[PDB]
């Protein structure tokens, strides 16, 4: 199956009392695996199969790295806020990571946000930074003047990240590589609507849709979000509105982890 590894950073200038000015957590797929913030000042595991497979040396080394990254993140946000000429509290975010797809191909990505909007986006194939405005453009110029850092990032994204991912995938294989099939039902809810409802499934990736007469995909389908049920499985739904003057026959189609399912109504 397709898997991904990513690390986020969040920086806040002038945070309210108690709230950390810096947070960083990693994920494998939807599972948190590591966390760090400016209060604890420690990198800690957020999944049992991480703590169990990475020696204290790992947590110690990356804790020191993160303490450095925390400082630099503050200086960078400070610089952005100065250049935007912004007062008050603003956010800085980063996301780095990679995907290993089923067919064995890979992707890698690195990008930044200011106040929750794209700011800088890395292209590891053109070895360049996309800038969304002239504040970002100034940073792009400084960053692109340092060719080694770009090369380094391409290497980390394409080789190291994928190696880390395969490693964590092995650590958590009992969780990450299991399959729990969906339980699927259709519910009727002066207008009638058919709800196709799935629950109990893992992984959270699932494809649900409505077809009419088995030949055409229905336009105007309301899609529900894939939601955590809290027990490590997920639930989702999709609905369509019925036309009493139409002679259409409907069916729910669900695809999950290589199995297709049809519920004819």
């Amino acid at each position: 199956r397709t898997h991904s590894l990513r690390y986020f950073r969040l920086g806040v200038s002038d945070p309210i009392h108690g709230v950390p000015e810096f947070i960083s957590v990693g994920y494998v797929d939807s599972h948190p695996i590591t966390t760090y913030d400016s209060v604890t000042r420690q990198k800690e595991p957020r999944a049992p199969w991480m703590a169990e497979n990475l020696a204290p040396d790992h947590w110690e080394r990356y804790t020191q790295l993160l303490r450095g990254w925390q400082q630099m993140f503050k200086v960078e946000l400070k610089r952005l806020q100065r250049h935007y000429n912004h007062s008050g509290s603003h956010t800085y975010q980063r996301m780095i990571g990679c995907e290993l797809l089923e067919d064995g191909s890979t992707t890698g990505f690195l990008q930044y946000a200011y106040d929750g909007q794209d700011f800088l986006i890395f292209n590891k194939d053109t070895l360049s930074w996309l800038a969304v405005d002239n504040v970002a453009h100034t940073i792009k110029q400084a960053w692109e003047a340092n060719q080694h850092e770009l090369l380094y990032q391409k290497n980390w994204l394409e080789e190291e990240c994928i190696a880390w991912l395969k490693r964590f995938l092995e650590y958590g294989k009992d969780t990450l590589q299991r399959t729990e099939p969906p339980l699927v039902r259709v519910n009727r809810k002066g207008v009638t609507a058919l709800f196709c409802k799935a629950h109990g499934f893992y992984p959270p990736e699932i494809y649900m849709t409505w077809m009419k007469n088995g030949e055409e995909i229905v336009q105007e389908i309301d899609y529900g979000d894939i939601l955590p049920s809290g027990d490590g499985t997920y639930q989702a739904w999709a609905s369509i509105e019925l036309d009493p003057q139409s002679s259409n026959l409907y069916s729910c189609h669900v695809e999950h982890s290589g199995v297709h399912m049809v519920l004819q109504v």
Epitope: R41, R67, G68, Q71, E160, W164
Partner: antibody
Framework: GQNIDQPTEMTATEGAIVQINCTYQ??????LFWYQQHAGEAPTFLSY??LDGLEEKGRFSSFLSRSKGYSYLLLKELQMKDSASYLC??????????WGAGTKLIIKP | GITQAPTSQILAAGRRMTLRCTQD?????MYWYRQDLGLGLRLIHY???????GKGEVPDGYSVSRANTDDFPLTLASAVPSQTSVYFC?????????????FGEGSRLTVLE
């Protein structure tokens, strides 16, 4: 990582070319550095490689092959002032810089 | 740039020595290495930014502090013969990226019983 290997000493002639090798076994790779260190003095930065191929800087070039786990530092048109130790260092998966034992380059006038 | 002091020193085993290191380049990362014949540079202690420090490969017998960006003193609480070595302080704008190290002049220490 675990091992960075480079020859203890090399001797070449003034005006010629020398290739100083550095092989590495590490857990993870985030780039390879070359430093020059004259006897009794501080190391100074020469080069950094992290993708494959050859990168030139004046009389010195630095090559890397990740798949083979090695790099060389190439010195052309040797001069007496190139007499020095040349140190190899690799950043591993934890970004720990791991240093080879250095190669002492002797030049015959 | 970066300055190390003192640069040459004889020491009775048991004495407390502090090697000074300062840079005004505003580098966040600073390092203490010892260099010994036949070995690659070995890291003693390091600091990625002010207010934190970490242990290197051979921390034992040594301690550091980093209350500020500029200074990174290496203290030997009670020197021993095996601590005869050449000590290099080095700094880098940031830890763990492609930016190179800038080395101090080196400090030659001989600890004698």
């Amino acid at each position: 990582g675990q091992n960075i290997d480079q020859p203890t000493e090399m001797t070449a002639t003034e005006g010629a070319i020398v290739q100083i090798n550095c092989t590495y076994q590490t857990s993870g790779f985030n780039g390879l550095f070359w430093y020059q260190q004259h006897a009794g003095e501080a190391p100074t930065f020469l080069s950094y490689n992290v993708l494959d191929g050859l990168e030139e800087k004046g009389r010195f070039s630095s090559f890397l092959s990740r798949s083979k786990g090695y790099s060389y530092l190439l010195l052309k048109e040797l001069q007496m002032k190139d007499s020095a130790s040349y140190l190899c260092a690799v950043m591993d998966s934890n970004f720990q810089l791991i240093w080879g034992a250095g190669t002492k380059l002797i030049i015959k006038p | 740039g970066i300055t190390q002091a003192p640069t040459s020193q004889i020491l009775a085993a048991g004495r407390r020595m502090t090697l000074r290191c300062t840079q005004d380049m505003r580098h966040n990362a600073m390092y203490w290495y010892r260099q010994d014949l036949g070995l690659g540079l070995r890291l003693i202690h390091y600091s990625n930014t002010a207010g934190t420090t970490g242990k290197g490969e051979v921390p034992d017998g040594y301690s550091v502090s980093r209350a500020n960006t500029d200074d990174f003193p290496l203290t030997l609480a009670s020197a021993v013969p095996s601590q005869t070595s050449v000590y290099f302080c080095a700094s880098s704008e940031a830890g763990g990226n492609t930016g190179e190290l800038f080395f101090g002049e080196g400090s030659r220490l001989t600890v004698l019983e």
